[PDB]
Design a protein around this nucleic acid. Structure first.
Lengths: 73, 246, 72, 105, 90, 50
RNA sequence: GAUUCACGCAGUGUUAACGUGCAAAUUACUUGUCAUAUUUGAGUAUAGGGGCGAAAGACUCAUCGAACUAUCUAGUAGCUGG
RNA sequence: AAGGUUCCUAAACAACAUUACUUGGAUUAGGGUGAAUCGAUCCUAAAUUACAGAUGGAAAUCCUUAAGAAAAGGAUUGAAAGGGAAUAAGAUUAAUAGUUCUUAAUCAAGAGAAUGGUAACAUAUCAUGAACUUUAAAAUGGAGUGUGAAAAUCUACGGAAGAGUUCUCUUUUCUUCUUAACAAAAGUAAAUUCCACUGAAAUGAAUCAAUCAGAGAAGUGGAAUUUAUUGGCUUUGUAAGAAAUUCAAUGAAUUGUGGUAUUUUUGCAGUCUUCAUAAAAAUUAAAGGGAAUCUUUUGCUCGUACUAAUAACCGCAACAGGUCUCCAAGAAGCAAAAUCUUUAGUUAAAUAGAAUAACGCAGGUAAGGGAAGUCGGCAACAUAGCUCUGUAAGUUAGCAAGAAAGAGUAGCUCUGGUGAUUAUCGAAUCAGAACUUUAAAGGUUAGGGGAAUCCGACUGUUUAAUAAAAACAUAGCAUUCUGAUAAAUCUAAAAGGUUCAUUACAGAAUGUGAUUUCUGCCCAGUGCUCUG
RNA sequence: UUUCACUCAUUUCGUUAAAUGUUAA
C-alpha cells in the first residue's frame, strides 16, 4: 500500500484507466480514498469534507465505489 | 602379539595430515624462459599464517609473461619481506633479500633458503622456520656448487638450481618452553595424530616389545639393527653411540 | 552401563531397503547390500549359505515369462 | 509473558535460523525470520571498507538501483579514493621518469 | 604489585621457578611494541608467529617468532649487503 | 519421521492397508478355515522393521 | 589449562536401599566436578593375528587374553552319564 | 532422529493397561495431511564411486586428473543443523495450515552514448557497453568491558470499562487499553570511517580501559555506512473495517504521554589471546577495456496428520534407565541456587479399607559422660551468609589464606553521603543515632579446624558392570636414525598408500617424568657400531 | 677386470609438454 501526498496526484490517478476499485472510509477526523489499482492500494487522507466531495465528482461511472463506516461491510 | 602403533601409522586412517585450512603448496614458480634468461617482477601482496607450519607464507603476484592476466604464487617468507615489496626472480636478479636466483650466480658465503635439490623441482631444502643453507664453493668445470645443509651436511647441486636469498621467518619458534599439556595439544591442530605418547614399558607384552612384567623395564638392549622387521624395530636403530655426551 | 542405558541412543539407521532384493540390507555407508550383493552385477550366493540359496533363487517368485517358455 | 514456538521445521539456533519476536494484535507475539549480517566491499589494495555501498547480501545488489552499487569515479566500487590517487601518481610520475631516464638521457 | 615475578605471575606457582623465569623473557618481547622500519613509529605488534603488522602505518613484516628481528636474521642482511657490493665492483 | 521419501511413504501406506481383517462374507464360504489374519501387527506390539 | 556456586555430569563413601530388583548395574543422601586437554548432535574414516586405546588386555551392538555368523562337522575324547 | 495411522469422530468392552473401568496410545468403521515464498530438489566440506589406464592366478584391487585423440577446463555422490531468489496479519476445521479463505505483498522467467558537488560522494530504470582480466560478497575463532535499540518485568502521570473485599478499615486490590509482511520520510539518535578550512609545544585530545597526532591532532562545516524490512527510533500507508475489554437486544463505547531501574535478545566499538589464526562451491555485483551500432502470462515433482516422552522413541512392557534442540512470569536473594505462587498442564499415573503387634526401610530427638565402640570417628553430630579487626611456620617469593582467632547483625522512628536540568526530578547503595524487644545469618541455602609423615609435581585420563589410585598422560630432561629417489611403514602386487599441502627450529623411534641439587665407577659378557 | 666415456632402454621429476640446441640478427 502506498500513500499519495497531494490532490493533483490523485486527480491524475482517477482520470487514468488503470483504476480497479475505490473504497471510501470515514473516520472520527479524516476520510481515506483507498483507490485499488492493479499493483498497489493508493490512499489519500483528506481532512476537509468539501475536498472529499470534489473527489466523488471526479470518480468515473463504470467503476464500483464502496462506502465504509463505523460498521464493516 | 598385536600390531604396534608404529605399524598402524603407515595405514593412514586416523593418522592422516589435518590439512584442511592450509593455504597451499609453498614453492617457486615453474621454470620457464623468463626465469632462465631474464627476470620477472613479483609483488608481495600479503603475509599470512599457514596452519601446521612455523614460517609465514607470502602471496606473491607475478604478471603472466606469455598471456594476459596474473599468476599467483605462494612463497615461504624470508625474514624481512614486507607487504608491497617487489621481488625479482631469474638468472639476472639482484642479490637482495627475497629475490630468487640460480644457485650458481650467488657468491661464496651467501645465505639462501628454499633451495632446489634438482632443477625445476620448486624448493626442497632449508624450508623450516629460521633455517638456511650457505653456499660453500662453485665448480665451473661441471657447473656444480656446494652448499651446507642446516644439519651440517654438505651437498653438491647443479649450478642452475634456484634459491631464495635470506633467512626463513619465524626464527626462535622452538626456544619458548611449552608449559602446559594443553599447549602441546594445540600444537598438532594442523598435523598428525601423534601427541600423547604412551611409554612402551607401560604397555602389555602383546602390544609392544617393551611390555614388561612385574617391574617396568625393557629387559633387552634398546639398540637394534637397521634390518629389524617392522613391529620389533623400537628404540634406537643402527646407533653408534649412547649415553650422555661429554 | 553396557546394558540397558546404552540402548537409548540407538536411533540412526545402518541398513535400509535395497532396490534389487527388497530387503533391509542396504548399508548406507558401505553403499552395498549385505544380502543380494548390490551394485555387483552377480547375485550374492555362497555354498556355505545353502539355506540362503533356497530362500531366494529361481522358482521362488512369479516366473512371469519363464513359466510359458518351459511349458512351451 | 507470552512464549512462542519456531514456525518452520528448523529446531536449532543456527546462523540461518535467526528469529525476532515481535508483538501483534491482542497481545500475541509472533516469530519473524531475520536476515544475516553481511560485509561491505573492500579496497583491492588496502582492504578498507568502501563508502557509498551498502552492506547487503550479494543477490540483493540485483534489486538495488544501478547507481546505488558503485561510486562515480575511476575504479569506483573496487578501490578507495586513496587507493586511486596513488594509482594516478604512480602512472604519471613513473612515465615521466622513464622519459628522462631513457629517450636521450 | 610483585617483587620479582613480573608478567609470569599469571602462571601462579605451578610450573617451576626456572621455567617461569625462562618464559618471562619471551613473553615480554612477544607482546612488546617495536620501531617500524618504514614510519619509525613504535607501533608494530605481533599478529601470528612470525608476522608483525605496523598499526598506524599499514604494513606487514615477516620477522622472528617473538621478536621483530632476530640476531641471526640481522647479520644476514648485512652479510648479503657486503657480498652484493663486492659482486658489482670487480 | 515427518520428512519421508515418496517410495517409502507408499510402502508405509501398504503396511497400513494390509493391517486389516477377514471380511465377514469371506468367512461364510463353504469349507472356509481362514477366520483371522495371522499377519496382523500393531504399532505398539511389533515394529515392522522398515 | 586460577578458587567456587548453578543448569548438567560422574560415581568417593554409606561397603545404605534393591538384590526371583524400577533396572541383565538402578535408586537416595554424601562426595567430586561443572568451557578451552570443555560438553555434545549429525555426517564421515578405521575391521578380526584386524582396528582403536592419556594403556585397564580396556573397547570393537548386554559377545573379547582374539567379535558375530555359516560350512568343514554328527571335529576328537584312554574321560563322565545312559 | 525414531515410530507409522498411534491423529479425530461415532458405535462398542470379549481380551489388554498386577483391583475394576462406561476410560484408553485397547476393538470395529469412517474421516483427516492442500505451498511459486517452509523444506527436499540446487552447491560444495570431511569423504565416496564410474569409462579408459595400471596391477593381479583369481575374485577383484589401485588411480579421481595423473597415465587418455576422454572429462572453455575437469567426471559421480556426499548436509531436511553448513551456503541459498521471493509471505505476512486475521479468520476458519471434529483434525490441516508461514499450505485453506479474506485482505495486503514479494521473487524468478518471460511477452508488450548524462548531470551535480572543491572533496568525501549524490541523482523513482535512467544516463549503451562484447571478448578478455581483476576485485569484493556468499565467507569464517574465542574471551572480557562499555554502549545504542527492541521486547519482557517494574514504575510515574492521566483516565475509560469490568471484577474482588467491605461491618473493621481501604479515593482501595486486580484484569484490558494491541498491531504484521512490505513500503513512506513530518521529527530525530548512538557509534565508526573519510572530506574541506587551518596548522598543535606553554603539547594537546580522549576512554570504564585505552588510544591518537606535521605521511597531520583538537575546532568549525560536511559525506558515508551500521543499528532484527525500505532508512535505527517515534510517526505514517497497511489500519481499524481487524483484534482485545465492556454494554444492549445483530448494534454501540474507548484504545495518552513518560523513566539517570532490571533481565533477555540484537548489533556496534575498540582491548586481550594463540608454536591454535579459526571451510569451499553454487551464485552475484563492480571495475579496467573499447567490440558493435506500466500492463499481462506461467511458476512443475515430493514431505506436510500425531508423539517427541514418568504411556507413542531404544531397552521383551504404560520399565524410577537412556536420547539432540527453541520460547521462558512474580517474590527473595550475589545467584537461571533452595522455598512459595501466576499463565498453561494435571489430580491419574504397577488396587484399596480396617487395626496401629514384633523385626524392618526412610526421616528424627535425648539425661550424665564424651570415641571408653570399632580394623578404622564408618555413620551421624558439628562449622557455615555478610561486615570489621587480625592472621603463623614454611615458600619455587607467586602463595600458604576464607590460615588460625575475636567482635557485630532484629524491629521501629529518623539523619547524612554518592547525580541530572535550571527549585524540580531520579538510583538503590553506604555510614551514623535514639527507642523497643523473645538480643536478631541460620525457614531454606550455607566451609569443621590444627600438627605432621608417604606417594604423585600441578590441570587432566583410566579397568561400561566389585580396583579412580601411588596407575596412565603431561610439560621438562635426554638418547637414536634420516638430505627427502630418505627414515618409519601399509599392501599379494601396483605410473600403489600414510607422516608429506612436508624438508633438520623437520620427520620417525624411545627412556625418565615439574622446579632445585646431583647423576658416581665398569666396555670383561650380551647387544649396537666402525673410517679397520 | 674394474676402470671409465656416451645414451638408447631405465629411474626420479616439471609444466598451459610455452623460446632446449646451433647459426643469424
Amino acid at each position: 500500500p502506498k500513500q499519495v501526498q497531494e490532490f493533483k496526484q490523485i486527480l491524475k490517478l482517477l482520470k487514468s484507466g488503470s483504476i480497479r476499485a475505490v473504497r471510501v472510509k470515514t473516520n472520527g477526523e479524516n476520510t481515506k480514498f483507498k483507490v485499488r489499482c492493479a499493483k498497489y492500494l493508493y490512499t489519500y487522507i483528506c481532512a476537509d469534507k468539501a475536498k472529499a466531495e470534489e473527489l466523488k465528482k471526479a470518480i468515473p461511472k463504470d467503476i464500483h465505489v464502496v462506502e465504509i463506516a463505523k460498521k464493516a461491510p | 602379539g598385536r600390531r604396534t602403533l608404529s605399524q598402524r601409522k603407515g595405514r593412514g586412517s586416523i593418522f592422516k595430515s589435518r590439512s584442511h585450512h592450509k593455504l597451499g603448496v609453498a614453492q617457486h614458480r615453474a621454470i620457464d624462459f623468463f626465469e632462465r634468461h631474464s627476470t620477472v617482477r613479483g609483488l608481495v601482496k600479503s603475509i599470512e599464517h599457514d596452519p601446521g607450519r612455523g614460517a609465514p607464507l607470502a602471496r606473491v603476484v607475478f604478471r603472466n609473461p606469455r598471456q594476459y592476466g596474473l599468476d599467483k604464487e605462494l612463497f615461504i617468507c624470508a625474514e624481512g619481506l614486507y607487504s608491497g615489496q617487489y621481488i625479482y626472480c631469474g638468472s639476472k636478479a639482484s642479490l637482495h633479500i627475497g629475490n630468487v636466483l640460480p644457485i650458481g650466480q650467488c657468491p661464496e658465503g651467501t645465505v639462501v633458503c628454499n633451495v632446489e635439490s634438482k632443477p625445476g623441482d620448486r624448493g626442497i631444502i632449508a624450508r623450516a622456520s629460521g633455517n638456511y643453507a650457505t653456499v660453500i664453493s662453485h665448480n665451473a668445470d661441471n657447473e656444480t656448487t656446494r652448499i651446507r645443509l642446516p644439519s651440517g651436511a654438505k651437498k653438491t647441486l647443479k649450478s642452475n638450481c634456484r634459491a631464495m636469498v635470506g633467512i626463513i621467518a619465524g626464527g626462535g619458534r622452538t626456544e619458548k618452553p611449552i608449559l602446559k599439556a594443553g599447549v602441546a595439544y594445540r600444537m598438532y591442530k594442523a598435523k598428525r595424530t601423534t601427541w600423547p605418547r604412551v611409554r612402551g614399558v607401560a604397555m602389555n607384552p602383546v602390544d609392544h616389545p617393551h611390555g614388561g612384567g612385574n617391574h617396568q623395564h625393557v629387559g633387552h638392549p634398546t639398540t637394534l639393527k637397521r634390518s629389524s622387521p617392522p613391529g620389533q624395530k623400537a628404540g634406537k636403530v643402527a646407533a653408534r653411540r649412547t649415553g650422555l655426551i661429554r | 552401563t553396557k546394558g540397558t542405558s546404552c540402548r537409548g541412543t540407538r536411533h540412526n539407521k545402518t541398513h535400509i531397503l535395497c532396490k534389487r532384493c527388497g530387503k533391509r540390507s542396504w548399508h548406507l555407508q558401505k553403499q552395498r547390500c549385505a544380502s543380494c550383493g548390490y551394485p555387483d552385477a552377480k547375485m550374492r550366493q555362497y555354498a556355505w549359505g545353502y539355506k540362503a540359496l533356497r530362500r531366494r533363487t529361481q522358482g521362488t517368485g512369479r516366473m512371469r515369462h519363464l513359466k510359458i517358455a518351459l511349458k512351451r | 509473558a507470552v512464549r512462542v514456538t519456531y514456525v518452520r521445521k528448523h529446531s536449532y539456533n543456527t546462523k540461518s535460523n535467526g528469529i525476532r519476536i515481535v508483538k501483534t494484535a491482542g497481545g500475541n507475539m509472533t516469530v519473524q525470520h531475520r536476515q544475516k549480517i553481511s560485509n561491505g566491499v573492500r579496497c583491492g589494495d588496502c582492504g578498507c571498507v568502501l563508502a557509498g555501498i551498502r552492506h547487503i547480501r550479494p543477490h540483493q545488489y540485483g534489486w538495488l538501483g544501478k547507481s546505488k552499487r558503485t561510486v562515480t569515479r575511476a575504479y569506483g566500487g573496487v578501490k578507495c579514493h586513496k587507493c586511486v590517487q596513488k594509482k594516478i601518481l604512480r602512472a604519471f610520475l613513473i612515465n615521466e621518469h622513464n622519459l628522462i631516464k631513457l629517450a636521450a638521457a | 604489585r610483585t617483587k620479582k615475578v613480573g608478567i609470569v605471575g599469571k602462571y601462579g606457582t605451578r610450573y617451576g621457578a626456572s621455567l617461569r623465569k625462562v618464559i618471562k623473557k619471551i613473553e615480554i618481547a612477544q607482546h612488546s611494541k617495536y620501531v617500524c622500519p618504514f614510519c619509525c613509529k613504535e607501533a608494530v605488534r605481533r599478529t601470528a608467529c612470525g608476522i608483525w603488522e605496523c598499526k598506524g602505518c599499514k604494513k606487514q613484516i615477516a620477522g622472528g617468532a617473538y621478536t621483530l628481528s632476530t640476531i641471526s636474521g640481522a647479520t644476514v642482511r648485512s652479510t648479503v649487503r657486503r657480498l652484493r657490493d663486492a659482486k658489482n665492483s670487480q | 519421521t515427518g520428512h519421508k521419501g515418496f517410495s517409502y511413504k507408499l510402502k508405509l501406506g501398504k503396511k497400513i492397508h494390509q493391517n486389516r481383517g477377514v471380511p465377514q462374507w469371506f468367512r461364510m464360504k463353504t469349507g472356509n478355515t481362514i477366520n483371522y489374519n495371522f499377519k496382523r501387527r500393531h504399532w505398539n506390539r511389533r515394529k515392522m522393521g522398515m
